[PDB]
Each structure stands twice: as structure tokens, then as C-alpha cells.
Design a protein around this nucleic acid. Structure first.
Ligand code: MG
Length: 137
RNA sequence: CCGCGGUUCUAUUUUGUUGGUUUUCGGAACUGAGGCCAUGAUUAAGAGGGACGGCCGGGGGCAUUCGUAUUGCGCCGCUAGAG
């Protein structure tokens, strides 16, 4: 009770932290083991007011700090990790904010379980956007 | 190839007293059974065709099945951002 479980000191409570780090944003999202219920979702957009640093490591660590204090306030100790890129037909590698957010989560008084990749990997995707001649910059 | 059976006509004769001439008279017409031919087919192209045996291949057509992804929808969660 009191915004927390009745777990003993010897046992730790396990959550699931989806880190959807794409380009131009970074989502850190803590849920239960099934993922049905969500505790807190913080993203770099609500921590930098520049519209350019949404995927910045400076904003990513701040977002991870907020979900860390919220998890500790809710009495959550151990936390699995599910790293996710944009996926689909689009880019399959995680954005810049993934490493800073993960480092912040470890150092801000949290425990780490298993790390897994939940990137959407198609067997063979649809027509990816851009044209056959690519994005001419 | 060689001989033997097997057909139709015809240059000439002088069986010079005319007549009839036998003129099979000479040869050329169609044919059946034989004998002999060492009897008669060059080989099978590092040419080809086809057959035969076990394979082999994202080769083709039809049918069937599977995969996550994308999009949308319907529920539940939490937040003011998302892109
Ligand atoms: Mg250029």
C-alpha cells in the first residue's frame, strides 16, 4: 500500500522499460511485466524547448532521471529493458538518446534486468518512403 | 549376267514359159521355270536427332500454406505533447 507493493526487502519488484529511441525524439516508458499498465512516460520534447534537442543526450538523460524518481517514488526497484528503433521499413538502429538514457537509468538508483531488442523487423516490408532515387540532399 | 520354255509381224529368192512359191525360210514382238552373282546396306564424325538411367536447377504454369511489418479499427493504461 501507499503507492507501492508489500514486497519484502530481500525480493525486488520487476518492471519493464521500453526505450523507443528514434531520431528527433526519445521515449522512455515504464510499465508492468505484461506492459498493460503504464507508470510513467517521459520524452525529450517535454524537457527541452528548442525543438532540435528532442533526441539530444542532454534531454534523454533528463527524461530517464524523471522516470527514475517516479519509479522509486512508486516503489519499483528492478527494471527490464526493451530497446527499440523506428523499425518497420525505416531505420533499424537506435537513435543517439538510447545510450545516454540507459546510462542515466543505471546511475540514478535503479536495478537492471534483461536487455532485449523489440525493433519491428519485417520479413519483407512495404514500399519504403523516399522514391527510387533516394533523398537528394 | 547366262542359257532353256513362253508371241506377233516382216527385207529378200532365182521351185526363170506366167500361177502358186515351203519361203518354219533370216530376224523381232509378249513370257515361265532355273543357274550363277563372295549376290546386293562404307563406317558410325570429340556433327547432329531421338531413346534410356540417376540426378540437378530463385526455369515455367496452376493450386495451397506460412511470416513479421505497414495501415486502419475496437477495448484498456498514463500523460501535453507528437510528427
Ligand atoms: Mg550530395
Amino acid at each position: 500500500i501507499s503507492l507501492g507493493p508489500q514486497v519484502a526487502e530481500g525480493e525486488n519488484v520487476f518492471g519493464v522499460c521500453h526505450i523507443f529511441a528514434s531520431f528527433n525524439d526519445t521515449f522512455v516508458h515504464v510499465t508492468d511485466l505484461s506492459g498493460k499498465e503504464t507508470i510513467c512516460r517521459v520524452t525529450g520534447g517535454m524537457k527541452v524547448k528548442a525543438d532540435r534537442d528532442e533526441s539530444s543526450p542532454y534531454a534523454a538523460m533528463l527524461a530517464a532521471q524523471d522516470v527514475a524518481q517516479r519509479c522509486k517514488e512508486l516503489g519499483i526497484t528492478a527494471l527490464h529493458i526493451k530497446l527499440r528503433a523506428t523499425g518497420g521499413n525505416r531505420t533499424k538502429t537506435p537513435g543517439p538518446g538510447a545510450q545516454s538514457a540507459l546510462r542515466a537509468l543505471a546511475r540514478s538508483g535503479m536495478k537492471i534486468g534483461r536487455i532485449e531488442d523489440v525493433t519491428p523487423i519485417p520479413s519483407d516490408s512495404t514500399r519504403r518512403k523516399g522514391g527510387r532515387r533516394g533523398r537528394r540532399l
